[PDB]
Amino acid sequence: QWPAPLANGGKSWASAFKKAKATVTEMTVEELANITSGVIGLCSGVTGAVTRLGIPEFCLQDGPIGPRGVHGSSQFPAGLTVAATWDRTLMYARARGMGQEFHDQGVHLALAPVTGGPLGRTPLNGRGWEGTFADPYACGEASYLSVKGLTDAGVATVSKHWIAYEQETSRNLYIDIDGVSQADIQLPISSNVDDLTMHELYMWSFAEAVRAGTNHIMCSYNRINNTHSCSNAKGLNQLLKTELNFQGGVVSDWGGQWDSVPAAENGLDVAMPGKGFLGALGDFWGATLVELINNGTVSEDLVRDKAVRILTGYYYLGQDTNPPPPFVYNTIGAPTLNATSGYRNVRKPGTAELI
Amino acid sequence: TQWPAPLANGGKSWASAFKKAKATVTEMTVEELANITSGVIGLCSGVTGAVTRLGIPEFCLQDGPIGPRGVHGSSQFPAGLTVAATWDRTLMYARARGMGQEFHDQGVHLALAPVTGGPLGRTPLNGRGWEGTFADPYACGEASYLSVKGLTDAGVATVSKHWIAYEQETSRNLYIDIDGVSQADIQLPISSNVDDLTMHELYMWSFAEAVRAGTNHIMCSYNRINNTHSCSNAKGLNQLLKTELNFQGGVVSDWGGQWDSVPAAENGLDVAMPGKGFLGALGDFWGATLVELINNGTVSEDLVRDKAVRILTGYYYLGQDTNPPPPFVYNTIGAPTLNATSGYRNVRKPGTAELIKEIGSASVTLLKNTGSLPLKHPQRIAVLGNDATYNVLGPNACGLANSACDIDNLNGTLTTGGGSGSALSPYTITPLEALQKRAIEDNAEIAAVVANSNTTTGAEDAIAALLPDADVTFVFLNRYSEEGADAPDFSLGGDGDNLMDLAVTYSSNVVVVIHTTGVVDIEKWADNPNVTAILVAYLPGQEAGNSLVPVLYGDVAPSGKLPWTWGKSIDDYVPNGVVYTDAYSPQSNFTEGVFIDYRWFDKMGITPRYEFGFGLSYTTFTYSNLIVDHGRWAKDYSSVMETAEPFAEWDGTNSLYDVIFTVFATITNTGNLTGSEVAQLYISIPGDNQPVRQLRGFDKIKDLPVGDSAVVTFPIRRKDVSSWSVVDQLWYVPNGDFLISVGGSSRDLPLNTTWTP
């Protein structure tokens, strides 16, 4: 079908890749499943530590205007708003500023920016404002610069949402809350997209995102030609990881992962949110992935590539020798998470006037 | 287990022996059935329980694909790797025959030998591939047949090993339960997941040959196959081996290869080793447990009587009743596992040393020669490498299994590999002695740096001072590997890389000799003009030096050729050659099919450095006059036992091993010196996803004088031209064009013709 091309570190991540491979090489099957699946904590998502090799939990945090659910930060204008400036300098400085606030709040991975999913097939898209232009060229430019800003600030990006994620209606994220299951109720809207259109319109901004060095990409809730984005082999293994030569990790949207084995085989590298959100949003790896490896269904080396893709960003942005500070706010919310919040003021002179 | 256990009948040559077997087994109590089918404590690698009432003694099962291991008073033969490289059926037989006499005379009933297609050569990193012969079914077939014959002709029963698809040491995970730690709780053995065509065309080939040659027993391997232990795989043991190959002898467990009581009993195992040996640490699943399984109705007395009959057929057939082996006198297990004194018995016969030398001289393979060989009478000789002299701790310092020296010990000349297939030496003829003897005859001087060049103070200075004035510099490299591990890469062992860097710096006439268990990485030096000649001497046993120097000095031309493919990069071979995982149930999918060693290279259009079947002479040979004589056919009556391999053309009277045509060719000695030449025949058998070409014959012409010619002749068996029909489950000769090719290697084929039935 479409096999999983191994990470090699690409142009800029060469040394980071090699530190990643080295670390992954030392990891037990449990450790591999610990880092490739979400655990419980204060951030939108959290990767399990590899505590024996001193790899810590990574804080994944919303969102594309800056860290969400924190005090002591600034509320930046939306992507829609910078787009309207048609000013590359502002697009970059916006992201750079968002970036320092993410770093200084303690975020390893910013669940941002929005780089062409949604792009704007419908002017009614409920979350269209999070993107930029209704145009691949201009969106590509803003996406490039948005990615660079955040990464220059020392925070790994997760560009979102790959791909063809053009309506909120019946995205139908995976949720098995109460007795009921979305999987029984209704499958996600299937974006059915020819190959010219995928190439010339939707992939264009993501290509720019990859070129800018986005460390990760988030696969979307919709299905493409009736396969989930997060387990679409053509989309992740071929279009993204081969043609766009993407060297980083594919993070599930929160409930965008619907299965265990196809996901592992067809491009997904991180299961989010895992144990977070009471497990309500699916929890298909973790202990399940351990079992699948130990019984020969899934190759350990397949999962080592996932862990390598995750650690590449860690090492490239220097989070190993320059760790972000502790994240201090409960952004999940009680009663889902009963944790107290600290306080940290992260607002810096210059930010208000940039805004 | 829809594959029932077929009853022994003694097949072709063993009819008599089988009948005495059954007679004796029929008198046996249940306790006697259990005593003989499981190992007991003794001096040998394994020992079957006696049936003392019926006068059946303990049988000594002893390790030795190069001869009796762990004994003094014997000879260290070359490894199977080394005979393979001769391509000389005569030497193949005589090596086994010699090994046989030493086995018998030390008192061994069953030789755990030879290695007949497991491992065959899927990975060139296999830590124990060296115990085998060729990375080729056909050639492994021929050597397997002959090695078996020579052993049995000495009056020692063989246990051909290891059945089957045993193709990496890593995660072989023998069963063991010692120090509160069981292997069952850590990881299962690697699972060779082999399709049906591959298993027939590749892995079973050499085992068919060992069966035909009358192998008395066969050893089931440590690996699972399709996720079922080999030693309890019914389709493997009961169907493929005991039905299709019609195998009439015993299946012996590898040591810790048996994992359970009842499936083993049900699915093809005949003998549980080592039982009460090795503190019972490697599992003891039968014995008293089998007694209870019979008494309580779980396993039929009939099933176990068959096991005992298969054991006892070999005993009678080789006449060990009326002509018993002498007592075995050496503790080969080792304190503290077994605390028992050793006797002394000398078994080395006149002739053996010279046969070991000859195998060396016929095997050593010339890979590069820009003009420096043969040597005339150089006056100033430099030698580099610890491989050139003795292990600094003594030739048997590394213990009973040649594996106990420190990772950095200068072990001297690598005359054998490590593990169960090793053996002690009474001495080593070092390359440095033999070179010195010759130097002295020429009134020359000779000096060797044998220290560790990287860690010995003065060694680099000493080298820099010595080489520039030397007329020739010999460099001795080696690469130890062992059972229990795969090589991590092609790296030279010890300080090899350093020695080569230094030698090309201070000398323009470097001759390299490699003693190795397998392919090594020489890419850094092989195209350097300062390296004038490269030889690989494999594992020549005790006569390392005196075998080599005659070839260096042109007393005899090199005639050895490569029995596997020498690629430039490990990355050029079959992928996932060794699988590394902590997964509880490790998998290895043999998705390459039949395409291993040179079939991979050929199909994928990859050029090796030196191809399968390559090896230079001090002369050249021109090939002419290819004849395919369809009138030269013969009925097969020569085998010792018959298989039951089904084939489309079975008329009721004929055989898969009938020779259906013979092909001929002429070689002419077209250079300026006498030389021996290994002619080779390959066939392209038509079909889908088929090999570019397949070795189907070889003939070594000896000492062809300048100007002279000789006819080379290749019998072609029906099987040689057949494929396995997965659908129809039999062998068949396909339709289409059969390219038949002949020449000096797998890439150097001047003669070609099409046959089309």
Ligand SMILES: *[C@@H]1O[C@H](CO)[C@@H](O[C@@H]2O[C@H](CO)[C@@H](O[C@@H]3O[C@H](CO)[C@@H](O)[C@H](O[C@H]4O[C@H](CO)[C@@H](O)[C@H](O)[C@@H]4O[C@H]4O[C@H](CO)[C@@H](O)[C@H](O)[C@@H]4O)[C@@H]3O)[C@H](O)[C@H]2NC(C)=O)[C@H](O)[C@H]1NC(C)=O
């Ligand atoms: C969603 O569904 C849509 C609708 O079906 C999908 O759009 C199809 O996408 C496939 C590609 O995945 C595309 O395939 C081609 O059709 C061409 C003819 O129209 C073929 O010529 C072309 O084949 C070549 O490419 C293959 C892939 O590399 C090769 O295997 C093949 O050998 C061909 O290539 C050789 O020849 C050319 C010269 O002709 C040379 O340049 C090459 O290098 C090579 O030597 C494709 O097979 C369909 O045409 C698309 N259909 C439409 C209507 O767009 C879409 O992919 C789906 N999306 C997802 C995410 O699944």
Ligand SMILES: *[C@@H]1O[C@H](CO)[C@@H](O[C@@H]2O[C@H](CO)[C@@H](O[C@H]3O[C@H](CO)[C@@H](O)[C@H](O[C@@H]4O[C@H](CO)[C@@H](O)[C@H](O)[C@@H]4O[C@H]4O[C@H](CO)[C@@H](O)[C@H](O)[C@@H]4O)[C@@H]3O)[C@H](O)[C@H]2NC(C)=O)[C@H](O)[C@H]1NC(C)=O
């Ligand atoms: C390890 O796993 C591999 C992977 O599966 C496994 O490979 C398979 O091996 C089986 C054999 O056990 C192959 O079997 C079959 O599929 C054929 C179609 O491709 C089918 O025609 C075969 O047919 C019959 O043979 C059986 C056995 O004799 C017989 O009982 C049936 O009645 C069929 O034969 C009849 O009809 C024939 C004419 O049509 C006639 O000639 C014959 O005499 C008889 O009357 C067979 O069932 C399977 O295809 C393999 N698959 C692959 C992927 O190769 C290995 O066998 C496993 N190895 C171990 C050690 O377990």
Ligand SMILES: CC(=O)O[C@@]12CO[C@@H]1C[C@H](O)[C@@]1(C)C(=O)[C@H](O)C3=C(C)[C@@H](OC(=O)[C@H](O)[C@@H](NC(=O)c4ccccc4)c4ccccc4)C[C@@](O)([C@@H](OC(=O)c4ccccc4)[C@H]21)C3(C)C
């Ligand atoms: C584990 C094993 O292969 O054991 C045997 C004993 O019969 C087996 C067949 C084998 O071919 C034989 C004879 C050999 O000749 C091998 O070359 C050989 C070995 C491969 C070696 O074994 C190993 O290296 C094992 O991988 C190694 N494995 C472990 O330590 C292990 C233990 C628990 C769980 C998982 C793994 C081991 C070392 C030492 C003692 C026992 C086990 C032991 C062993 O001493 C030799 O073993 C012993 O002498 C021995 C084993 C158990 C108890 C007492 C003595 C070895 C030698 C001679 C060095």
Ligand SMILES: *[C@@H]1O[C@H](CO)[C@@H](O[C@@H]2O[C@H](CO)[C@@H](O[C@@H]3O[C@H](CO)[C@@H](O)[C@H](O)[C@H]3NC(C)=O)[C@H](O)[C@H]2NC(C)=O)[C@H](O)[C@H]1NC(C)=O
């Ligand atoms: C199941 O197997 C056991 C292991 O072989 C048997 O026990 C061994 O039986 C041998 C006889 O067949 C004994 O050998 C002899 O030893 C005595 C010393 O005590 C000498 O007098 C004899 O001359 C000597 N014979 C020789 C070698 O020439 C072994 O001593 C004995 N070993 C043990 C462990 O006791 C069982 O007999 C066997 N059980 C059955 C039911 O057959």
Ligand SMILES: *[C@@H]1O[C@H](CO)[C@@H](O[C@@H]2O[C@H](CO)[C@@H](O[C@H]3O[C@H](CO)[C@@H](O)[C@H](O)[C@@H]3O)[C@H](O)[C@H]2NC(C)=O)[C@H](O)[C@H]1NC(C)=O
């Ligand atoms: C001289 O012979 C020595 C054997 O008598 C040999 O030592 C052994 O070398 C092998 C390498 O082939 C080592 O292999 C193992 O190394 C570690 C062990 O902890 C494992 O991770 C590997 O998987 C592998 O099994 C042996 O450990 C080593 N044996 C001992 C007792 O130290 C030397 O290498 C030989 N000398 C030279 C210069 O080659």
Ligand SMILES: *[C@@H]1O[C@H](CO)[C@@H](O[C@@H]2O[C@H](CO)[C@@H](O)[C@H](O)[C@H]2NC(C)=O)[C@H](O)[C@H]1NC(C)=O
């Ligand atoms: C798998 O990941 C989980 C999630 O982080 C690990 O546990 C935490 O380990 C950190 C140190 O890295 C401790 O500060 C926390 O107390 C642990 N949290 C919990 C919930 O106990 C776990 O250690 C990981 N396991 C392995 C084998 O690395």
Ligand SMILES: OC[C@H]1O[C@@H](O[C@@H]2[C@H](O)[C@@H](O)O[C@H](CO)[C@H]2O)[C@@H](O)[C@@H](O)[C@@H]1O
């Ligand atoms: O909770 C979301 C609000 O949705 C409102 O409605 C939407 C429309 O009916 C239509 O566009 O479909 C989407 C779902 O695909 C609806 O969310 C309305 O239902 C309100 O109750 C909600 O506040």
Ligand SMILES: *[C@@H]1O[C@H](CO)[C@@H](O)[C@H](O)[C@H]1NC(C)=O
């Ligand atoms: C392996 O484990 C998974 C999850 O625990 C299970 O769904 C699957 O069926 C298992 N397969 C085997 C062969 O045991």
Ligand SMILES: *[C@@H]1O[C@H](CO)[C@@H](O)[C@H](O)[C@H]1NC(C)=O
């Ligand atoms: C062998 O193939 C099966 C699917 O048929 C798969 O589960 C297993 O992981 C494969 N092994 C490899 C190639 O890693």
Ligand SMILES: *[C@@H]1O[C@H](CO)[C@@H](O)[C@H](O)[C@H]1NC(C)=O
């Ligand atoms: C948090 O507290 C609420 C109310 O005190 C409780 O019902 C809920 O179960 C708790 N949440 C979790 C995830 O434990």
Ligand SMILES: *[C@@H]1O[C@H](CO)[C@@H](O)[C@H](O)[C@H]1NC(C)=O
């Ligand atoms: C028969 O004996 C074996 C070995 O003691 C034991 O595993 C099994 O439970 C017994 N079975 C029955 C049916 O008594």
Ligand SMILES: *[C@@H]1O[C@H](CO)[C@@H](O)[C@H](O)[C@H]1NC(C)=O
């Ligand atoms: C052999 O002797 C050693 C050393 O006294 C002892 O520890 C060991 O238990 C003995 N071996 C056996 C199997 O009796």
Ligand SMILES: *[C@@H]1O[C@H](CO)[C@@H](O)[C@H](O)[C@H]1NC(C)=O
């Ligand atoms: C070959 O040897 C000479 C010394 O004899 C040395 O100076 C020269 O650099 C060497 N050349 C190569 C290609 O190593």
Ligand SMILES: OC[C@H]1O[C@H](O)[C@@H](O)[C@@H](O)[C@@H]1O
């Ligand atoms: O994990 C230890 C490992 O070390 C060697 O390099 C490998 O080739 C394996 O054979 C061995 O088991």
